[PDB]
């Protein structure tokens, strides 16, 4: 405790001194205008997805979402948003096969690490499906924390 | 994040023997012993008993850093009194006193 540094009782920390709970929310929207291209939510596949991220999608359900209680860490994908291949001039869909299912998913921030708390599925005033995911994790006082 | 495993406070790891005895070069009949996974809960007993032995010239210890459960013990004795054996004697002594402590408590408790 030499400067403004301090000595904290580890046993007290163990019991629960200054322990806190942290929440973070993610979100995404269904799509824009269906001009020969639409966007949605659905679990992607390594061989049936174009420009897939370097994380994982095996924690996603049918609609690309994760049920509460599931432990999700780091680069793990939480919202399996998909957006059709756009190799053409108009930036719309295209007559391709495996790569037609181009994704546009959302994962956790690379430094995050916790479990899914709550998932909300609604629509905006434009009738567009909206996904919002809240996750949580415990913060336990470290030697770099400020008090 | 990068916090150490609490098991490392008392359980020996791979390649970690409990004790390591090195010979000092700064003085004759003197050794330095490393206690792995062991703080001065035990260490302070050892020094205390060593200093009750009139054939011991030096007995002291230090914990070089609190991040690690390690304990340095330095022992210097008079000629012929191998410091290693001096330590062995200190241990025997401590245990014998603890045995009596237990017995006296149990008796006092029963009464």
């Amino acid at each position: 405790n030499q400067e403004d540094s301090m000595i904290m009782n580890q046993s007290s920390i163990d019991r629960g001194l200054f322990r806190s709970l942290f929440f973070r929310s993610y979100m995404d929207q269904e799509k824009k205008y269906g001009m020969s291209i639409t966007e949605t939510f659905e679990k992607p596949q390594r061989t049936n997805t174009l420009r897939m991220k370097h994380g994982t999608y095996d924690k996603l359900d049918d609609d690309g979402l994760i049920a509460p209680g599931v432990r999700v860490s780091g680069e793990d994908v939480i919202i399996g948003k998909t957006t059709p291949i756009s190799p053409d001039e108009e930036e719309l869909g295209q007559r391709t096969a495996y790569h037609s299912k181009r994704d546009a998913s959302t994962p956790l921030r690379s430094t995050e690490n916790g479990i899914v708390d709550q998932v909300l599925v609604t629509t905006n005033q434009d009738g567009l499906k909206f996904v919002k995911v809240r996750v949580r994790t415990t913060k336990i006082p470290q030697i770099g924390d400020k008090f | 994040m990068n916090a150490p495993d609490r098991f490392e406070l008392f359980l020996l790891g791979e390649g970690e023997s409990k004790l390591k005895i090195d010979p000092d070069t700064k003085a004759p009949n003197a050794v330095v012993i490393t206690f792995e996974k062991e703080d001065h809960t035990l260490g302070n007993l050892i020094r205390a008993e060593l200093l009750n032995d009139r054939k011991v010239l030096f007995a002291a210890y230090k914990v070089e850093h609190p991040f690690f459960a390690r304990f340095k013990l330095r022992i210097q004795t008079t000629e012929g009194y191998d410091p290693k054996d001096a330590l062995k004697n200190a241990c025997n002594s401590i245990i014998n006193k603890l045995g009596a402590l237990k017995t006296n408590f149990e008796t006092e408790w029963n009464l």
């Binding site: 949605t40 049918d62 609609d63 979402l65 994760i66 049920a67 509460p68 209680g69 599931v70 432990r71 479990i115 709550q118 998932v119 909300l120 599925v121 609604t122 629509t123 499906k129 | -």
Partner: protein, 46 residues
């Protein structure tokens, strides 16, 4: 068929799938809760 989500402001389960509309059949709400996974979650009590 499959419990995809549960109505908000009402314990009533919806179990609706894609294209079935987010509107709660018995409330009119548009919230929808995914509901806790079937998988058991282990915590280190430590």
């Amino acid at each position: 068929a499959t419990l995809k989500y549960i109505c908000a402001e009402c314990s009533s389960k919806l179990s609706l799938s894609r294209t079935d509309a987010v509107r709660c059949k018995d409330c009119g709400h548009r919230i929808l809760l995914k509901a806790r996974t079937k998988r058991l979650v282990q915590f280190e009590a430590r």
